[PDB]
Structure formats: structure tokens, C-alpha cells
């Protein structure tokens, strides 16, 4: 530890102590081997730069160190010395146009006014007091800005190529001393160069001993690191991936290190190289194969977990079933499957491994965390550690498994329960005990400084919250800066924490301020910004989403109490904030979390027209996206039964006070009818005949009045079509508007066309005297705008307006010639070739415009469509 000491003078003496050829060997192999003994985890953030500083400084004595790298100048040229300013300056800071011989020294005299002499010391004392302050202020500026140059430079007409070996190796060390990710590159390259070299000198009998020795050390490094510093954890694993024997590294140690250090790809290639090299005999090597799966599942690569768990190895197909359900985001079904895997008490073909039992334990802990089942997750994360009824949380430190796997979810789930009002003193006493031990303190305040800063803030220790959150920002920057630039998923999954830390930090500011807390005025301003500062609803996963929102919720309740002596403000934010978590859960396809949120807000939403209409709209949106995959028959239950009743509301006809909600409801109930009818088009003969009981009358009131078994779908489609058409009239009474409404008609109409072309329905043909005319005008009205779905769909027109010829009139006569001509270049070769068909009357005006505006665009394919 004296080898990281704060004073550069003591930091140098201990370096110079270990560098001595009796403390630490002089030959390069035994030096490289011995440096593995110069570690304990309290040094880890510095280690790579020290190991490299001990190897390259062995060259400080080498016969080549003062030789030139190249023997001759580039040509005949001449060179000089030089100097660099290097003192006080960055360029952008000054304005443009500006004693036996000497014993005479004992000749002296002294004041006799003690008063005048005291005035001299007062005048000196005030000048000194200013001089002290200004020189401290200058030493502040110059402390940040001081530098040193490690090589000397020449000057001349040409580059001074003949530099000494010294002049590259000194700066190469001086950078590696100073940036960790260069210290990773350098130790790796230099180490792998040393082990390539020993084959020049030493036998198989030595190389057995050496590679067993290095492997024996690297097991220790991965099993004893506590801070998992990403450049160090990755370095050992780059190195051990290059060579046989080293490649045998302890896989549960490797996987824990990579999972915690957030650096999965390098850990994967090691286990991958093992799984081929150690097996070019018990087939499965399950400890390597299942730990490789555990690494891939962390990076979210579910679609390759099929290729691990094919039943030829790891033969417990319950794992394959469980993985399939979470690959579809049925975390509730996946949580059931792992639960029964752990409960199944005897096995044909014999029991699963400790490796798989632990995999099911970790994967199921994670399922309850993608769900929001905090009481189940808190129970589960505490149940496996101790044999008491109230399990002793203090046992968690007993072996590195629990501290790796259980501790992260345990502290999260205790903390989540506190914030939603369950008053248990268990976590606060557990952390108070843990903070007695120096290693346990160093685990907590390094990995959990979010949870800890919330915990002390639940206690009103705003001072300890100020400490742990600031230390959360500093430990974020270290890890983020250290993740190497190519790891886009790793760096992206670090950024997700930066919003959470900033919600805490803003609130700790706000609660401290006397002028802010007194009255409502800046609280409205805070409430405004939080109402539109979300994470990425398309990309950021739900476990960072409910982090932001269960925190926002706590802060609003805490300010509410602090400013007791604004429910009409607070409820509006708390409800609209929670509504955004629902639609993002839907767009993330995570349904059971969305159900669980929906059912909670119903009894709040019932109180008001805007909250009720939004609750109905958000519940019915969620039913469509749910039903979309739900097989043959469960569709008509999951989208007719309740959803169709839910949009007809007497209270939702509140004089259509704003038209956007009417436009939105006018989509929802009609895409509802399409699904109900399209189910019966997938099979007519069974859905009604099997779903025989509760729905049939409300199904009749939801369709045509007739008991004719065929006409029900045409009745359903007729009331769908008019509702879809009503949505257009609301849409034209305001790019979120008409193009989305128009394209849903176009889709439904043209889907009825595809189905229609496969049979003969005359009375559908009769309303279809409108259908494709209402396709073409409204569908194409999109193409003046961005509208790329409709531009992708335009190849249909020219053949429907042949096989149903008459309605071609509705295309050319009005506004095909309104479409910006640059839209129609997309596949112009096809339309400009059709010029012999009568339908070329449609092509005419747009390819006239493209011939006028853009002859270069049409010419080349045109010369051969002109031919023949």
C-alpha cells in the first residue's frame, strides 16, 4: 500500500525499494513472474501502471537504452537544439494588439522605538497577509496547469529520425503511468511479447512450471479483486485468451468479474476459446457452457441461447422452456418455469448440476426484477442465505457467491419496499453493521452509492446523502472513462445511471434552499421539468424506468410533507408521469408489468374525465398489442369481451371538448372491430361454436343484427369502416394527424381488397364501389409529407386500377398531379415502361414533371422502356 502513497517523495522511495535487484529479481521472466506477488486489491486501480513501470525500468540499465533507433539521417541535413515555453500559459489568454571574507555583514544597528519596530512588523504583516492570499490563489491556478517534458527535441529542415531508444520508452511509460487504458494496452503487448520469447530459451519442462504458476496467480486475482476495475479485469482475460494452459481459468470467477465490471465480450471469448481448445470424456463441461450462457444473457443476446441449450448437452429442457418465455418477455411465465425447476424433487436421468441450479436461481431473481414483485424478490434474495425464520442478513458476507449474486438484488429490493412505505428497520441495521468492516465498507460505497444515498435520505441525513451521491458521481466517471471505446453496449448501459443520480442531486439542492421551500413558486418550475424529462422509451429497459419513477414519487411525497403549511399540482404530475411508464412498458412489449401498473391507477383515474379517458385509451392500446400474438381463439376474449364495452362511454361523449381525444378514440374502437372480425376470418367454423357462453349477445350487439352465420363478419367490417372514416373527419379538424388516420383506412380497405380478390362477394363489391376510390385519394394524400409507408405501398395501384378498371377516373382527374414530382422517381423504370397500357394516363403528368425538373433521373432506364 505504500506504493500508492499520497506524497510523491514517499511514492518514489517505496518504488525504488521494490525495484532493487535483491527484493524483486533482475532477469525478465522471474521479474514478470514475481510481480504477481506485488498485489492486494487496495492497489488495483494503479496496478497495471506499476507492473509496467517495474518491467520497462529494468531497461533503464540496458546496453541499447542510449543507442539511436536508426543509424543514418533521412539525407544530408543539419540539426539544432530547441526550447518550449511550458510555464504559465495556454494560447487563448492575452489580447491581440498589445564566510571569513564577508564579516562586514556584522556591521548593523537596531531601532530603540519598540513602537516603530512594531509598526514595521505590522506593515510587513499586512503585506505578508495579502502576499499569502494571492500566492495561494496563484498556486491554485498553476497546480492544475503545471507540466514536464520527458524527451528532449532537435530542430532542422527534416524530421530528426535518429532518436535514442530512451526517448520513446520514457514517454511510453509516462503515458501508461497516467491513463489506465494505455496501461491495459502496454502491459498486454509487453507480457505477450515476453511469453513468445521464452520458446527461444526454455524446455517443455520449464514451460509446464511457468504456465501453471501464472495460471495459479490469475485465479487468485479474479477470485480476490473487490473493485472489479474494468481495465484490470479485462487485461487478465485478454492475456489468458492468447495462450494454451492459461486458458483454463476458473469460469465462475471469470463470469462474476465480467458481469460486475460490465465488460461481457472479453469474458465470453475466453470461455469460448476454452470450450473448443480443452475439447477438440464427459461432453457438457457444464460449468463452462452454463457460465458462457450466463454471460450472453447479461448482454441480452437471447436469440443465441437457443444454440447453447439444445438438449444434446445440459439435458434439462425446463431451461430451454424458461429461456423461451423470457425471450418473448413473458417474465411471469419464465418466473413460474424456474420456480418449478427448483421445486422438482426427483429426476429421471438424474439431478441437475450446481451450475444449472445456480443459473436458475440467478435467472429467476432477475425475472422478479423485470416484473416489479418487490416482496417476492426481497423474500427470495434473503431466503437462501440462512436457516432462521427471519433470516440473518449479516450472513451475506459468508462466501463470495452470496456477495456476488444475492447482495445486489437484496439491497435493491429492501430499498424499494422502504420507498413505497413498508417501515422495516432490517436494511438500515444491516448497512450500519456492514459499515464497521473496511472491506464491506469498500464494497458498499463503491457499488451501491445510489441505494445508500437514498437510504440516508429516507432518514433526513441530507449531509450523508450529499456525501454518498457526490461519491456516486465520482465513481461513475472513473468507470465510464475506463470502459474502452469500442464497447458501445457497455458504455450505453453506463449512461442509464446518469439520469437517476441527477434526480437525487437536484432534489438535495432544492430541499436545502430556504427561498425555494417557503412557498409554491419554484416548486411549479421543478414539477414542470420532471413532467418532460424521461429516459428513452424505445431503448432504455424497465428496471431503469421504475428506478426513475419510484424515486420521483418518493421526492414528491417528501416535498409535500416539507411544504405542508399542493395535491391539485402533485396528482397531475404523479399521474401523467406514471402514465408514461405504461406506454413505454407497452412499446418495450413487457405486458405483465404494464397490467400491474394499469390496475393500480384505475381507482385514481375514475375520479376525473381526463384521467378516465386516458385510462380507457391506455388500457385498450395495451389490449391490442397483447392480443396480436395470442393464437387462434383467445384473441376474441382478450379484445372483444371487455375492451369493446369500454370505449362507448356516455361520459366520453362530453361534447367532444377537444377533438384530438375523439380522433384517438375513433382509431381505437375500430382497430378493435378489425381484430374481432379478422379472428373469425382466420377460422369461421370454430370461434363462435367453442366460445359458446358469456359473450354471444354482446357479440350480436357488437356486429350485424342477423343470425346468418356468414354475415356477422361483413356487419363487423361495415361498422369498422364507418368508424375508420369518422377518424378522418376528426383528423382534418386539428403529421401525427391525417397521414396516420388515412393510412389506417388505406390498410383496412386494401386488406379487404386482398381478401376480396380471392373470392366473389357482391354486396362487399357494392360498398367497394367506394372502397378503392377512398383508398386512392386518401392513401396518396400522405405522399406530400414524409409518409414512407404509403410510398412503399404505391406499386399496387396500377394493377388494381386494371382489374377494377372504372375507378381509375378517381386517380387522374384531380390530385395525382398535386403530388410533389420528386416522390415518384423511386421506381420510375416500372411506370415509364407501362406506356402502352391505357393506365399510362396516370403516369403522364408525374413523368412530364420529372422530364421537366429531372431529365437525368428518367433518361437512362427510359431509353430501353422507349425501345420495343
Amino acid at each position: 500500500q505504500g506504493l500508492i502513497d499520497e506524497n510523491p517523495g514517499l511514492q518514489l522511495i517505496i518504488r525504488n525499494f521494490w525495484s532493487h535487484e535483491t527484493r524483486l529479481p533482475s532477469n525478465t521472466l522471474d521479474r514478470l513472474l514475481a510481480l504477481n506477488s506485488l498485489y492486494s486489491p487496495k492497489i488495483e486501480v494503479h496496478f497495471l501502471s506499476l507492473a509496467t513501470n517495474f518491467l520497462l525500468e529494468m531497461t533503464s540499465m540496458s546496453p541499447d537504452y542510449p543507442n539511436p533507433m536508426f543509424e543514418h539521417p533521412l539525407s544530408e541535413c543539419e540539426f539544432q537544439e530547441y526550447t518550449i515555453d511550458s510555464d504559465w500559459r495556454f494560447r487563448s489568454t492575452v489580447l491581440t494588439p498589445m564566510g571569513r571574507t564577508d564579516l562586514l555583514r556584522l556591521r548593523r544597528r537596531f531601532m530603540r522605538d519598540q513602537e516603530k519596530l512594531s509598526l514595521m512588523y505590522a506593515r510587513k504583516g499586512v503585506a505578508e497577509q495579502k502576499r499569502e492570499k494571492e500566492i495561494k490563489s496563484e498556486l491554485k491556478m498553476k497546480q492544475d496547469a503545471q507540466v514536464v517534458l520527458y524527451r528532449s527535441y532537435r530542430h532542422g529542415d527534416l524530421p530528426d529520425i535518429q532518436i535514442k531508444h530512451s526517448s520513446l520508452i520514457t514517454p511510453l511509460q509516462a503515458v501508461a503511468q497516467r491513463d489506465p487504458i494505455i496501461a491495459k494496452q502496454l502491459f498486454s503487448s509487453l507480457f505477450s511479447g515476453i511469453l513468445k520469447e521464452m520458446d527461444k530459451f526454455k524446455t517443455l519442462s520449464e514451460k509446464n512450471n511457468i504456465t501453471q504458476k501464472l495460471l495459479q496467480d490469475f485465479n487468485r486475482f479474479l477470485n480476490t479483486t473487490f473493485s472489479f476495475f474494468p481495465p484490470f479485469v479485462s487485461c487478465i482475460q485478454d492475456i489468458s485468451c492468447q495462450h494454451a494452459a492459461l486458458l483454463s481459468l476458473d469460469p465462475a470467477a471469470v463470469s462474476a468479474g465480467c458481469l460486475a465490471s460490465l465488460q461481457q465480450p472479453v469474458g465470453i471469448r475466453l470461455l469460448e476459446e476454452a470450450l473448443l481448445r480443452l475439447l477438440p470424456r464427459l461432453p457438457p463441461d457444464v460449468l463452462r457452457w452454463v457460465e458462457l450462457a450466463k454471460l450472453y444473457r447479461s448482454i441480452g443476446e437471447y436469440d443465441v441461447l437457443r444454440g447453447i441449450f439444445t438438449s444434446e448437452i445440459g439435458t434439462k429442457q425446463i431451461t430451454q422452456s424458461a429461456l423461451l418465455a423470457e425471450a418473448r418477455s413473458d417474465y411471469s411465465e419464465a418466473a413460474k418455469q424456474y420456480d418449478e425447476a427448483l421445486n422438482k424433487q426427483d429426476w429421471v436421468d438424474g439431478e441437475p448440476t450446481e451450475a444449472e441450479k445456480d443459473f436458475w436461481e440467478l435467472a429467476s431473481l432477475d425475472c422478479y426484477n423485470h416484473l416489479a414483485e418487490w416482496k417476492s424478490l426481497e423474500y427470495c434474495s434473503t431466503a437462501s442465505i440462512d436457516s432462521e425464520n427471519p433470516p440473518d442478513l449479516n450472513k451475506i458476507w459468508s462466501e463470495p457467491f452470496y456477495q456476488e449474486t444475492y447482495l445486489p438484488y437484496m439491497i435493491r429490493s429492501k430499498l424499494k419496499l422502504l420507498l413505497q412505505g413498508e417501515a422495516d428497520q432490517s436494511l438500515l441495521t444491516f448497512i450500519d453493521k456492514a459499515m464497521h468492516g473496511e472491506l464491506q465498507k469498500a464494497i458498499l460505497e463503491l457499488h451501491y452509492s445510489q441505494e445508500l444515498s437514498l437510504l440516508y435520505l429516507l432518514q433526513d441525513d441530507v449531509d450523508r446523502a450529499k456525501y454518498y451521491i457526490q461519491n456516486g458521481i465520482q465513481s461513475f466517471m472513473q468507470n465510464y472513462s475506463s470502459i474502452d471505446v469500442l464497447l458501445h453496449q457497455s458504455r450505453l448501459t453506463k449512461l442509464q445511471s446518469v439520469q437517476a443520480l441527477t434526480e437525487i442531486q437536484e432534489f438535495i439542492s432544492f430541499i436545502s434552499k430556504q427561498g425555494n421551500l417557503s412557498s409554491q413558486v419554484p416548486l411549479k418550475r421543478l414539477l414542470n421539468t420532471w413532467t418532460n424529462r424521461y429516459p428513452d422509451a424505445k431503448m432504455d429497459p424497465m428496471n431503469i424506468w421504475d428506478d426513475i419513477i419510484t424515486n420521483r414519487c418518493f421526492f414528491l411525497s417528501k416535498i409535500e410533507e416539507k411544504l405542508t403549511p399542493i395535491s391539485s399540482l402533485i396528482r397531475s404530475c404523479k399521474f401523467s408521469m406514471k402514465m408514461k411508464m405504461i406506454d413505454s412498458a407497452r412499446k418495450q412489449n413487457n405486458f405483465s408489468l404494464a397490467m400491474k401498473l394499469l390496475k393500480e391507477l384505475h381507482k385514481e383515474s375514475k375520479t376525473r374525465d381526463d384521467w378516465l379517458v386516458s385510462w380507457v385509451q391506455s388500457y385498450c392500446r395495451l389490449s391490442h398489442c397483447r392480443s396480436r400474438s395470442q393464437g387462434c381463439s383467445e384473441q376474441v376474449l382478450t379484445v372483444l369481451k371487455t375492451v369493446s364495452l369500454l370505449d362507448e362511454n356516455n361520459v366520453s361523449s362530453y361534447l367532444s371538448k377537444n377533438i384530438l381525444a375523439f380522433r384517438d378514440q375513433n382509431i381505437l374502437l375500430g382497430t378493435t372491430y378489425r381484430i374481432i372480425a379478422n379472428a373469425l376470418s382466420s377460422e369461421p367454423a370454430c370461434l363462435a361454436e367453442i366460445e359458446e357462453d358469456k359473450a354471444r349477445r354482446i357479440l350480436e350487439l357488437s356486429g350485424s343484427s342477423s343470425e346468418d352465420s356468414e354475415k356477422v363478419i361483413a356487419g363487423l367490417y361495415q361498422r369498422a369502416f364507418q368508424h375508420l372514416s369518422e377518424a378522418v373527419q376528426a383528423a382534418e379538424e386539428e403529421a401525427a394527424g391525417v397521414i396516420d388516420a388515412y393510412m389506417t383506412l388505406a390498410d383496412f380497405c386494401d386488406q379487404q381488397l386482398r381478401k376480396e380478390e380471392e373470392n366473389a362477394s357482391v354486396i362487399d363489391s357494392a360498398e367497394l364501389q367506394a372502397y378503392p376510390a377512398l383508398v386512392v385519394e386518401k392513401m396518396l394524400k400522405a405522399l406530400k409529407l414524409n409518409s414512407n409507408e404509403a410510398r412503399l405501398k404505391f406499386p399496387r395501384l396500377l394493377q388494381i386500377i386494371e382489374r377494377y378498371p372504372e375507378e381509375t377516373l378517381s386517380l387522374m382527374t384531380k390530385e395525382i398531379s398535386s403530388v410533389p414530382c420528386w416522390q415518384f422517381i423511386s421506381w420510375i423504370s416500372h411506370m415509364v415502361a407501362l406506356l402502352d397500357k391505357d393506365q399510362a394516363v396516370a403516369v403522364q403528368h408525374s413523368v412530364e414533371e420529372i422530364t421537366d425538373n429531372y431529365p437525368q433521373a428518367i433518361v437512362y432506364p427510359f431509353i430501353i422502356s422507349s425501345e420495343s
Binding site: 420456480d339 427448483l342 441450479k357 431466503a383 462466501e399
Partner: peptide
């Protein structure tokens, strides 16, 4: 469905 567990002993 309720979430249940039991203890485990790490064989090392």
C-alpha cells in the same frame, strides 16, 4: 404464484 426458496450449501 407465490415465490418460495430454500437454503443451499455451496460445496466449493
Amino acid at each position: 404464484a407465490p415465490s418460495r426458496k430454500r437454503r443451499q450449501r455451496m460445496q466449493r
